[PDB]
Ligand binder design. Structure first.
Ligand SMILES: [Zn+2]
Ligand SMILES: [Zn+2]
Lengths: 195, 195
């Protein structure tokens, strides 16, 4: 699960003013600052584009952390490498993740995962800027799960929220599965690109 | 000195999936993910509008940090309270700050500050994507300095970069002083408000 094996990779070089998570440079960013950005994007670009922007930012984060996890192979169970994703997301202060059910085989291209999200920073941030939302709103967090799992699997795995604190639900709950297996699948993939 | 005691204001609450700096919730975010966002914002809104968005994001960060620093006023002169700013910015992994000249008296409305910035994450990220620019580019970093100092002084203190790594300089260098003393001060102020 890499409950800490990952933790070695997290270094604060404060005498150099830098933070590293693996080979990736990190900053500590106030959720309030991200909130202000979110409100301006929604106001300028409307809700739909803001969502795509945040999803793509999360996707880039997720892909980077998958690259980290894959360097530390050490013959880790398809299951153990997957769980490094939830750990890194938690270590990054984004959300507290509890795997509910996870069916995975990387060589076969098989993945179905369902997860519990507690204390989602994004849903809470969205509520602060917007009040409770009418649809799930953890765009960047969903982007991350998609990016990490897709890079891990070497194939497109898309996630969606089934419930969300941003909607006034008590937690978030997510489901990921291959692109092929979403009815409205590349309706979703459209919000995972640039331009 | 203060870098060490201020780092003690940072808490990792992993079992609740969160990171705290003073009272503010923080996330660890990949600079590569922020860069992808910046690239998309520049592509979709243009450099000028992107600049405002990031300056305002930074402003909100700085203003929040000001409250956290003030809380620890226990034995701290106008200089000590102002130094928490550069220190927190460094702990956040944003930039490594070396104060060059700090002239501050909050009661008197006196503020003149010059700082050296090394390893600005923002300038480094910016040039990787767009190559070197003509105007300085550390928008969010300048917004932070502006928000932090302004909230501390209770009057508007703007910062501008005299040098920037995004311009081909080896370092960034900033100057902060009251609003009335800047060439296009009122224009700048407009960048810190809605569009
Ligand atoms: Zn959510
Ligand atoms: Zn700069």
């Amino acid at each position: 699960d890499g409950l800490s094996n990952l933790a070695r990779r997290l270094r604060f070089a404060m005498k150099e003013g830098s933070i590293w998570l693996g080979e990736q440079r990190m900053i500590l960013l106030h959720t309030a600052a991200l909130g202000a950005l979110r409100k301006e994007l929604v106001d300028t670009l409307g809700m739909e584009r803001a969502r795509g922007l945040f999803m793509r930012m999360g996707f880039h984060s997720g892909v980077r952390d998958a690259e980290l996890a894959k360097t530390m192979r050490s013959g880790h169970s398809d299951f153990g490498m997957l769980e490094m994703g939830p750990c890194l997301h938690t270590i990054e202060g984004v959300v507290r993740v509890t795997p509910l059910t996870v069916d995975i085989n990387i060589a076969a291209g098989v993945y179905h995962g369902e997860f519990l999200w507690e204390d989602s920073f994004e849903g809470d941030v969205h509520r602060q800027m917007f009040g409770v939302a009418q649809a799930p709103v953890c765009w960047m967090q969903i982007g991350y799960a998609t990016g990490y799992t897709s890079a891990l699997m070497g194939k497109t795995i898309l996630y969606r929220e089934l419930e969300c604190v941003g909607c006034g639900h008590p937690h978030c709950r997510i489901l990921g599965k291959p692109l092929e297996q979403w009815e409205d699948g590349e309706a979703e993939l459209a919000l995972y690109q640039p331009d």
